[PDB]
Design a protein around this ligand. Structure first.
Ligand code: ADP
Ligand code: ADP
Ligand code: MG
Ligand code: MG
Lengths: 118, 74, 160, 371, 371
């Protein structure tokens, strides 16, 4: 039953978890950039007619509408999820308080100070 | 009550979301410039949409975690 | 190790004077200068606060790694301030939640023996057979065969 | 995506994703507000415990079922039950899943229309479909003919089907079910001294009924035997001690099914409404219905009912026909298994009531072609 | 600021700031005017010594408790006691501190209303709240269920609580307590020759009771043993010499708790009023109450009571249930520790009866929502 080695393992696993979280965040960023480049195709329109200008502009406006619709939907989803998260966090906090607050107090604050006053 | 209230809300949001759309009636160079600007705007919009997807996934997982925690009380 | 030397380095002569005044009773004379750890049980009680005796034994056996049975004023100082709270803020609650999400990369909401076992094996640390079961008790507090959020939180409670 | 096969029932809500063998979450459908005052502060006391949580705190609650006899009498509580079922027992938001509710035959229209309106407005599902609780139980048996007696906890109904063509003029719905048997058992227990009155103690009487009662093969012989020997008296330990001994109350409680005159009901038992339901059918499909009588529903789980019913029908029916009673071991969840099978079919995938259709015709769409 | 957790009690006033472990000042609640004439001039003789000062000059005083059985019978003396408690034992002016009094269950309304009127008009506190003496003792144990038997010095009451919901119809308040045991001990000491009559000598008999008496595990066996051997006779030195020897009066004084017929009271002992209080509760929370029986109050400090009570209840209760009696070593101050915990809560911070509310509704505000 070792004790200090337990603390050593705790710190080591904490550092390893930090490194893994950092590398996973980097992987997420790289994959997100890759997907953004893939889905948002680059277009070149040098030396084109104004009719093609109108067609491409209208297509871009329609894509803008669709993307804003998706953003509105996912924004509503995220707001609802945030509301649920706040509610559940409040509930769990209330449960933890009910479990622990009776166990917190000022122990031996002044009783030991009563030596010879009487 | 989400039968006309939510639909009208999102319809109004879409209507106000649309900005001015009057371009192709101008000279070619600046129109191309603004088309590239709007391409970049769509690029940023898609990036933000992906970020929102990931955030929603993480918050859903945290919701599952909180549900597990509240279920474990008994 | 010397990490707690750095931790105790913050306290300058201001606490050293008080600690020497307290320790003067330990050096009561008629000795060869070995200065054992016998009085430490009540020396750590000079102000009233006293931790569990098991932690006191861990502190006693941990320090003086040379086995000389000599309590250096440096060791005495760092062990006496060890009675006072000493922690590096224990990461952050959101940081701890992220760390546990990384721990629960299986997305199951629970960690079994295999999960944390592979987690520590990825660290490459040599772990004994006398261990693991100790870690099993540390993690599976409810004895339900897994690690929950509360069990992880107490397991990682304020550790930094 | 996958479909949600919910099954409201009356007494136990059974739900789960389509394509599995058993419902994922099964829990009583009761919503109980606390009734005492409450003095501890900050205990985190909620205003209504629903589902299986209120079967553990039932000592200080007043449980009340939101579904009386198939029909739904308290819409707010039913909405609460559905919300719990979706969010806490399955943890899947309904915005991304079709739903397949179930409904007893011959129920009021307003109940079904309100059900679809709730599912489309509050929970905002993509598409929902309502199915008769007996056709599913026929699916689960892997048959395509047969007359199914689905004796649930709210209402007992008997739908005959041949070659996939249901016979709407031969459905015999009777309102005696498990709940009335619980009340009658609670009423005859008073003949020994045990008085259960509180709505919480109805659950204890239900447990007694489930664990001890059985259906007698012959009623008079059992009544004579239990009155002479003492080989039947089985004891049971209440939630606090003080064991009780049930004598001939064991087979008298479920006997009400075959003699509804015990609880004052006029109609004939479940042994004779099946024969009447058969005789209303055409003369050429009676042999097949005789040979493929199907049992389902919870209340048909009494030990020894598949023999009593066969004996009774053989007494009633002509001597030449063969009487066979299909009693699968998975009787309780038969309706839900059938619901899963139906929702997993490819041919059925275009029968859902899509949301745009509801927006165009209102809640009265359910009575239309999309049944 | 910090709250003042006062606890009037009857026999010992316990007070202290909220958030500590033990009351700051504990002193008997007696006010004794001198009774003789007094010949020395300029000695600085006061007209009434209160609190612990009158336990040192009790030789020439006539001590009289201002609280008989929970209720307060002499309001001027109680006001004097409160004034002493605030100004001399704590030295904090009440103009800057909320107060949390405690009151026994089922007490007269006028007592509580007069208490709040005094606290708001004479001492002029910012806000005061009155709490039932048993809920606090349940707080201190860190539980949330359980049936607490708070046998104080004035009155013994038995409040069952489940999941934070108090059961108002199951409170059994009995007026036998430490004071009646003191009187009965003083009455049975006369069987050996020792006569204590003066109100000052009641304190000596109380000290004898505290230091020597104990509760017998089995009464008849102890009565037989004390009548043959002499291993029980413990001696005690009066405040002037002349040691006395207490024989079988040792376990006969506190036996009155379990047989109130000794002092002529009709009711059943504290071993049977707890079982009756449990049996009035619902049938599904009786196991939890059986397993979490809590003892509190001063009079439950007799050596050997936590075993006698458990034996008695196990005799009464069904054989299957487990009977456990929680007897923390800090029994005497359990109510005050619970009061400190309750006053230290953040959720409770808005339940105080603010002074402007009292100005708008009068003293009858205490019976209203702010309980
Ligand atoms: N093993 C059993 N033995 C006897 N009766 C049972 C058994 N299981 C359930 N029941 C009865 O059946 C009822 C449950 O029926 P169920 O099929 O769940 O109704 P629903 O059709 O509403 O789902 C219970 O109320 C109970 O009275
Ligand atoms: N150690 C003890 N042993 C036996 N009886 C005691 C002991 N301490 C106190 N008592 C009895 O309890 C009474 C004090 O009870 P207490 O809890 O102070 O009442 P209150 O509820 O009014 O505060 C005293 O009158 C005394 O008779
Ligand atoms: Mg059913
Ligand atoms: Mg008291």
């Amino acid at each position: 039953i070792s004790a200090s080695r337990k603390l050593q393992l705790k710190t080591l696993m904490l550092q390893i978890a930090k490194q893994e979280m950092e590398r996973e965040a980097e992987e997420r960023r790289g994959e997100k950039g890759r997907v953004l480049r893939t889905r948002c195709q680059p277009l070149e329109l040098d030396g084109l007619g104004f009719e093609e200008l109108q067609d491409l502009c209208r297509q871009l406006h329609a894509r803008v509408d669709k993307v804003d619709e998706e953003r509105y939907d996912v924004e509503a989803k995220v707001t609802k999820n945030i509301t649920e998260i706040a509610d559940l966090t409040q509930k769990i906090y209330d449960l933890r308080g009910k479990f622990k607050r009776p166990t917190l107090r000022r122990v031996r604050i002044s009783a030991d100070a009563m030596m010879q006053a009487l | 009550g989400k039968r006309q209230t939510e639909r009208e809300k999102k319809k109004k949001i879409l209507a106000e979301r649309r900005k001015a759309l009057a371009i192709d009636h101008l000279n070619e160079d600046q129109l191309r410039e603004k088309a590239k600007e709007l391409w970049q705007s769509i690029h940023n919009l898609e990036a933000e949409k992906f970020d929102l997807q990931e955030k929603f996934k993480q918050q859903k997982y945290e919701i599952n975690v909180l549900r597990n925690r509240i279920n474990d009380n008994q | 190790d010397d990490i707690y030397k750095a931790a105790v380095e913050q306290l300058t002569e201001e606490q050293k004077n008080e600690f020497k005044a307290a320790f003067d009773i330990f050096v009561l004379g008629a000795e060869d200068g070995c200065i054992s750890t016998k009085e430490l049980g009540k020396v750590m009680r000079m102000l009233g606060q006293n931790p569990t005796p098991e932690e006191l034994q861990e502190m006693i056996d941990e320090v003086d790694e040379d086995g000389s049975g000599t309590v250096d004023f440096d060791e005495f100082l760092v062990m006496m301030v060890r009675c006072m709270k000493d922690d590096s803020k224990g990461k952050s609650e959101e940081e701890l939640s992220d760390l546990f999400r990384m721990f629960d990369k299986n997305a199951d909401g629970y960690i079994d023996l295999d999960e944390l076992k592979m987690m520590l094996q990825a660290t490459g640390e040599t772990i004994t057979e006398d261990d693991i079961e100790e870690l099993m008790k540390d993690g599976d507090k409810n004895n339900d065969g897994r690690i929950d959020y509360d069990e992880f939180l107490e397991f990682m409670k304020g550790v930094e | 995506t996958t479909a949600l096969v919910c099954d409201n029932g009356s007494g136990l809500v059974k739900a789960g994703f389509a394509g599995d063998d058993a419902p994922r979450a099964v829990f009583p459908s009761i919503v109980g507000r606390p009734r005492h005052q409450g003095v501890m502060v900050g205990m985190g006391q909620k205003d209504s415990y629903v589902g299986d949580e209120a079967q553990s705190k039932r000592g200080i609650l007043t449980l009340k079922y939101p579904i009386e006899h198939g029909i739904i009498t308290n819409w707010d509580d039913m909405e609460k039950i559905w919300h719990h079922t979706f969010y806490n027992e399955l943890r899947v938001a309904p915005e991304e899943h079709p739903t397949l509710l179930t409904e007893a035959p011959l129920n009021p229209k307003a109940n079904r229309e309100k059900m679809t309106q709730i599912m489309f407005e509050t929970f905002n599902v993509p598409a929902m479909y309502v199915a008769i609780q007996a056709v599913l139980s026929l699916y689960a048996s892997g048959r395509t003919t047969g007359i199914v007696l689905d004796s649930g906890d709210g209402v007992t109904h008997n739908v005959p089907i041949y070659e996939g063509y249901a016979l709407p003029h031969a459905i015999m719905r009777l309102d005696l079910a498990g709940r009335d048997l619980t009340d009658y058992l609670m009423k005859i227990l008073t003949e020994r001294g045990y008085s259960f009155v509180t709505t919480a103690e109805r659950e204890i009487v239900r447990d007694i009924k489930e664990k001890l009662c059985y259906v007698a093969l012959d009623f008079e012989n059992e009544m004579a035997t239990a009155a002479s020997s003492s080989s039947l008296e089985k004891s049971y330990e209440l939630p606090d001690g003080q064991v009780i001994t049930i004598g001939n109350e064991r087979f008298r409680c479920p006997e009400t099914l075959f003699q509804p005159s015990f609880i004052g009901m006029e109609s004939a038992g479940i042994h004779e409404t099946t024969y009447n339901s058969i005789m209303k059918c055409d003369i050429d499909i009676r042999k097949d219905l005789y040979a493929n009588n199907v049992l389902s529903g919870g209340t048909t789980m009494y030990p020894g009912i598949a023999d009593r019913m066969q004996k009774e029908i053989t007494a009633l029916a002509p001597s030449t026909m063969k009487i066979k009673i299909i009693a699968p071991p998975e009787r309780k969840y038969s309706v839900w298994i059938g619901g899963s099978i139906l929702a997993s079919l490819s041919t059925f995938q275009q029968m859902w009531i899509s949301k745009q259709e509801y927006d165009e015709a209102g809640p009265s769409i359910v009575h239309r072609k999309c049944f």
